[PDB]
Design a protein around this motif. Structure first.
Motif, PDB file in Angstrom:
ATOM      1  N   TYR A 130      42.522  43.071  37.049  1.00 28.30           N
ATOM      2  CA  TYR A 130      43.529  42.151  36.522  1.00 28.30           C
ATOM      3  C   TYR A 130      42.946  41.206  35.504  1.00 28.30           C
ATOM      4  CZ  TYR A 130      46.207  43.952  40.457  1.00 28.30           C
ATOM      5  OH  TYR A 130      46.851  44.772  41.353  1.00 28.30           O
ATOM      6  N   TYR A 131      43.700  40.963  34.426  1.00 26.64           N
ATOM      7  CA  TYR A 131      43.269  40.125  33.315  1.00 26.64           C
ATOM      8  C   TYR A 131      44.295  39.062  32.986  1.00 26.64           C
ATOM      9  CZ  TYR A 131      39.895  43.921  32.387  1.00 26.64           C
ATOM     10  OH  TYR A 131      38.890  44.852  32.494  1.00 26.64           O
ATOM     11  N   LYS A 132      43.839  37.923  32.467  1.00 24.26           N
ATOM     12  CA  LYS A 132      44.710  36.840  32.009  1.00 24.26           C
ATOM     13  C   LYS A 132      44.210  36.367  30.650  1.00 24.26           C
ATOM     14  CE  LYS A 132      46.808  32.388  33.211  1.00 24.26           C
ATOM     15  NZ  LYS A 132      46.452  31.060  33.776  1.00 24.26           N
ATOM     16  N   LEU A 175      36.031  36.254  35.084  1.00 25.42           N
ATOM     17  CA  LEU A 175      34.793  36.912  34.688  1.00 25.42           C
ATOM     18  C   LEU A 175      34.731  37.280  33.231  1.00 25.42           C
ATOM     19  CD1 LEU A 175      34.385  39.535  37.561  1.00 25.42           C
ATOM     20  CD2 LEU A 175      33.748  37.142  37.608  1.00 25.42           C
ATOM     21  N   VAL A 176      33.520  37.271  32.696  1.00 23.76           N
ATOM     22  CA  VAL A 176      33.227  37.705  31.346  1.00 23.76           C
ATOM     23  C   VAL A 176      32.199  38.840  31.435  1.00 23.76           C
ATOM     24  CG1 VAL A 176      31.508  35.864  30.976  1.00 23.76           C
ATOM     25  CG2 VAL A 176      32.568  36.996  29.026  1.00 23.76           C
ATOM     26  N   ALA A 177      32.327  39.848  30.569  1.00 28.12           N
ATOM     27  CA  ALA A 177      31.413  40.980  30.572  1.00 28.12           C
ATOM     28  C   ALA A 177      30.168  40.686  29.754  1.00 28.12           C
ATOM     29  CB  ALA A 177      32.111  42.211  30.033  1.00 28.12           C
ATOM     30  N   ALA A 207      38.866  38.733  32.809  1.00 30.94           N
ATOM     31  CA  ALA A 207      39.192  39.440  34.038  1.00 30.94           C
ATOM     32  C   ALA A 207      39.129  38.515  35.240  1.00 30.94           C
ATOM     33  CB  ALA A 207      38.246  40.607  34.230  1.00 30.94           C
ATOM     34  N   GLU A 208      40.015  38.735  36.215  1.00 32.01           N
ATOM     35  CA  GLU A 208      40.013  37.947  37.442  1.00 32.01           C
ATOM     36  C   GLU A 208      38.888  38.415  38.340  1.00 32.01           C
ATOM     37  OE1 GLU A 208      43.392  36.753  39.756  1.00 32.01           O
ATOM     38  OE2 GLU A 208      44.806  37.377  38.187  1.00 32.01           O
ATOM     39  N   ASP A 209      38.265  37.467  39.051  1.00 31.71           N
ATOM     40  CA  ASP A 209      37.275  37.801  40.068  1.00 31.71           C
ATOM     41  C   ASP A 209      37.987  38.742  41.073  1.00 31.71           C
ATOM     42  OD1 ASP A 209      34.617  36.293  41.668  1.00 31.71           O
ATOM     43  OD2 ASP A 209      35.995  37.585  42.757  1.00 31.71           O
TER      44      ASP A 209
END
Lengths: 208, 208, 208, 208, 208, 208, 208, 208, 208
Positions: free
Chosen positions: B13-15, A30-32, B32-34
């Protein structure tokens, strides 16, 4: 074929990267949304302008308001602008925005910034600090700080301790320049407002 | 050669973007992860269905529960589904999910939404509002709202003021259509659960 | 021509995706900066090393400190490292970092992790758990957990209830391997520190 | 280097595909020119509008004129529009054009059509038929039917049996929609006219 | 893997576009074969040459033969060329071909044309007309008009009313030039002949 | 953005090339739809099979029916297949289809064909002819000839001179092979039927 | 920049693949030179032609010579062709070449082959065998078999047991066809000869 | 247009590189066919399995058979499998195949090998050797060694000294791993057999 | 996903082309490894240098040793270099390598070569020959000839007839130059040695 999906985290809106890219796996991420481009109204309350001359490897204090003064200015400017608040609404967030520009043309450098949210009214910040692992300001030359986490008067606003809902910010601005730079700053508050306006007309009294 | 890196922010959670892209500098940035595809179990508790007919440029209220009722429904449905809760677990987050679909075929429009988290039980929302800077719902036709930030009964749940851990939501749904649209809504709660199940078998009593 | 823009959310920094991509619409979306690469100083306080042997489909507890002990270790290591704290500063965040590596060469598997923030000192975690929807650790083999949300002694630190500012973490590590794997873990705290150092020299006393 | 070549078949104009493509072997093949974009004047005689509500898997009759009435309407509208016919001319073809549009916005479906040329005035068509291997109408939402293969009055037009030069059409319109669709139809005749106007001025009488 | 397919419509031959393209869905569509490159023999009967000087925005009459004369010329030239017609054959079509070229070099303009098929012998065409929605002649500088839809003499040809099988054409030629242009025209008839010649030798008499 | 447009010429359907291409200026040109893939029902009436052995540079006669016999076979096979004809319908066209295949494997050559429509019952065709500018059959190995341009019995069919609506075909088949080739032919009639079936059920008598 | 390198293995020449490719890591690998295109003279001794008719899934014996006969034919043809052998030379290899072609045109199939080197003169091969994991002959329709591993007469050739230097071959040819195929075979011996001719002229006697 | 060509060198088959590449100058070079994919039957005789534990930088002996034993095992297994040998056949080659796999999952390393053909029965190999310029085994984890260059019993096989036709192999296997690796080996003989089966049926006796 | 596979033919190593290419169907084909880059140790024994001046279209003899002398030089140089031969080893092959370079700069031509293996000691080669279908030397300017197919003294080496294991070579070198070229040659023997060194240390005596 990709499907678009959205999430909301405390009024921060997100969309799947794969659906954002496809616009012409990545989808699992996801992107904000840009807050100013995203849901809710934008309400920019410009507070003041200020000229600062910044030496290389330093940053100067933009604003040093006491807590009471920050809240006085915020409440006053917001209510002065808004009244009457005709519909149920929610302040999603408030951003302290610092807009910066050179006072002279033909200068090429990047702006740098650092802020502190808490802090407290019982603290006097240094007017000049050294640059230490700063935030790099983008080419829009704006530093935007989220401050988040029914009143007739400021006295009521304080009595309902509504000031506990958002931080008192202090901000420093500098440049990556190797010479002193004179900069014109414009400090504003941008409120993100979610309005719940009924599908109902305004009638001249008496109605019907 | 790119290296993958991960971060966790309050169960988000982020990558690094560069490692997400490479899958077939950008690396310095995170995505961010879904949440539904990310860590933790998904637990969908479908609450109800509802048909709403929405006029252009408006949105209708989906749910108007009082705080006590929202908590009653949430606790009851969650415990009814979960019991027995056999292992130590953490509710990472709870999402109010609104799934929407047209009741008629051959319609092409996008869904729009807006919610409010706080609010309080002592407030009656408008049933119909005007569309103002809404959230645009993706092609999955789902609006997902994070609500975050050991009980035998609902009375105990209230006594331990556990309801203070998550917001009571109100949600509005509309469309970008220029005609009235009849829509079927399905409202659910999706719990993100992190289970700490020991590497231990279940034995018929008496064990050993 | 794309313009760069930045936002700050509770010390998380963001930049528009379109300006990040262009480096050689997407612009309406934001990506977060890597915290360790972003603003503020990095301060890594390595706490201990530990060897764990993990069976397939399981994860072992890395750390089981009581709350008082977690705070004792954190305060002691931080103050021992930092003193003297010469300038006004803000701890932006604290990350519990788990670095993992195989003890044997020629192994190819991915690391998996799960943590819990709250929890409380009055709880004993299982030493071994089953793998359930874990977080997948990237190729840097590091799991980084944000713990966020003037003291002469630890007693003062507790008296000012400063421990309420950050969570006591418990972390589990496993692998996606189909054999037992011996792993060497290194547990650290990485503080993100925002320093406000005045543009002022250090003089030998007496000054001037 | 490709050379352009043209052919005419009963007032249908063709060009070699290779020369049409090159515009920025295939050359041995021809493509027909759009009749409305090709040689000869366009003359659109709009006859009527009509609203039809069509059920899924069906098509409704657009026009059910008797032969005498079709010819009356055609001759009357054409002569009313044209008179005076000042120059020698040839009617290359006549198209019955059916223009269709939804009466409601936010509908997405394709239009389907079927016609019959002969037929005869001594026949009553069904008002509603089932969809069977129809013609798929393009995104211009127009169905164009060629009807091909000096009069002071309609009586003379009939006496010279000029009506034998073109067919009496009946047309059905439906959709590929799975719901009933209300559609606004506009029925016109588009004449393709080849005018042979001398290079001679119009003088006020007496000339010279 | 695409498959080639052919259709014949009244001696017009077609092939699927997808199979024509592949030569190095589109397949569902057909393209017509160039008549001169397609099946059947080509037989060009050159009738005459003519010089015409054409003013801008006008076209001049190329040929003004009476019906009897057109048929006399056609029958005479065809039989003179063909006799003896040794095998069963079918005239598939006849094209009136107008070949045009400038009489002067270093001119750059396009040729324009218009024709009329019916018409009748009892009609005198204007020698000069204005350009109105003409046919644009390709770079081969040839305008080819299809005229379609056992005789010892022309008298027999007329008696068997074989002249009813094809139209008497009149053709106009002009240019898109802004100056007068002198043009050399060559008018021919190209017959498309389908010959049914037996697999049988020609013997010197007496045979065997 | 390209728009699709359609035209109908005597039951031949056309679409703009640009809209056909875009499927993943050219738009001003049309391509015809494959008749078997286009509007109207397909009805294949297989008449017979036949083996022919064809020498290089020759073609053999496939069918030599007298006019009366062609019409007898066509009417009989069509009515036998169709009865009862329950709805109003229009025969859009009839194609004489010749399907060809080698009787032996591992042969590689192309099929060639030629036909004649008129002709008349008072004519005996050569059984073997020489190849002269033939039609090249595509890889589907089928030659499809359009024959175009309420009866209880064949006698009635003849009395209403309905046979004047379509031609009696004769067809020749050969190959581009340099050896004799044995070929299996299948001759069929494919009717294109446009059915006007009312949106009305079939009831068991008595209805209602 | 790649460097070319060569190797020789028992008169088989090789070059590095990377240098062969570059002609407009892979370099570490070698490709063999075509023997007929590589070093040494080519000397084709055509022995005979033969027609064979081969049934599907079978192969027929091309040559069934006894050892003595194979050597007689080889020595005789080679010496007859070569004499006088004026310079020192080395027979690098001898290839039994089978060239095959269809006797009829318009056939499309691949040739298949199998051989046996040893074997011995005291063995009678089957004239017809089944196809079992054959060698697939390339589009040059040639099967080339290496036979490797000063005489005035054949008697001397045998006495010096020079026949032990190369194998007596037997070869079978078939096709992947599903019909019987008549094939014309040409059997040759291609000698690869390395000639060591001195840089010395031929003089008329007496020299000098 | 490239032409395929083939060569055979002592039962090794080759094709021109250019014709192998084109499959979707280089042509002057040849590539060898995979022996197992090339002409002749494959016959895999699996001899045994063996577990070996190999230390880094070493290789262990897989098989240490005496010559008599190697021949006993080869002849016995081959005849046991083959009998009855019904048709004339040629053993083209025999490959000693070593198949290797890890006994544990999640290991990533490459296999290394070395063999020796001659050698003799009067030699005892080291059980463990150091890795010195080994052969790198491909990802199929198989090392294939060619051993090349009518019997009722093994005694006859020895008496006809047929054992002189192929070498007695000894093979070592190791890894490029930096830890000890346990490996499961499977040793087989793959015979390449060229069968000359007549096109003749098997009849129940008596035939005819 | 392609899999790597290897084969060994008499110490020539091969890998599948598809797996060699993929490094960044073809897979069914093999490429040989460069012998000097492939398995086994390289041992270069430089024998001598020699200057030769070569005329266009000719090649000069590099070495003319008698058989006894070739073996004396080979054995002596090999044993002198190798002794002590401490481990069991196999000489896989021996290459006669001819390295060539111009004696003058700024020359651009290619080197050409030809050799002969057998030959015998009872033969005197021409010192100068003509160029006839030579081997083209690559840009590494080296010609490498394979010569293949426990001794205390040369006398023993001869007594055990070990010289029968490899050929006595004679080599000629020339250029494709059109002028005389002076060339410096370096002749070496490169042994490919497969060493079987036990995993055993060297101890100072007495061991243990």
């Amino acid at each position: 074929p990709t499907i678009g999906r959205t999430y909301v985290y405390d009024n921060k809106y997100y969309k799947n990267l794969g659906a954002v890219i496809k616009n012409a796996p990545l989808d699992n991420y996801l992107v904000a949304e840009d807050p100013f481009l995203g849901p809710g109204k934008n309400q920019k309350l410009t507070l003041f302008k200020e000229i600062r001359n910044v030496k290389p490897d330093t940053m100067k204090l933009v604003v040093g308001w006491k807590g009471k003064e920050f809240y006085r200015e915020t409440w006053t400017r917001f209510m002065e602008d808004s009244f009457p608040i005709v519909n149920d609404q929610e302040v999603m967030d408030v951003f302290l925005v610092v807009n910066m520009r050179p006072t002279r043309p033909n200068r090429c450098y990047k702006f740098l910034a650092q802020h502190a949210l808490r802090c407290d009214p019982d603290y006097v910040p240094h007017d000049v600090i050294r640059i230490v692992e700063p935030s790099w300001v983008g080419s829009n030359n704006e530093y935007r700080i989220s401050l988040a986490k029914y009143t007739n008067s400021f006295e009521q606003f304080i009595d309902r301790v509504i000031w506990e809902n958002f931080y008192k910010p202090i901000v420093y601005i500098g440049t990556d320049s190797a010479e002193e730079e004179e900069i014109l700053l414009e400090v504003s508050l941008v409120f993100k407002v979610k309005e719940f306006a009924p599908d109902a007309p305004l009638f001249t009294g008496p109605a019907y």
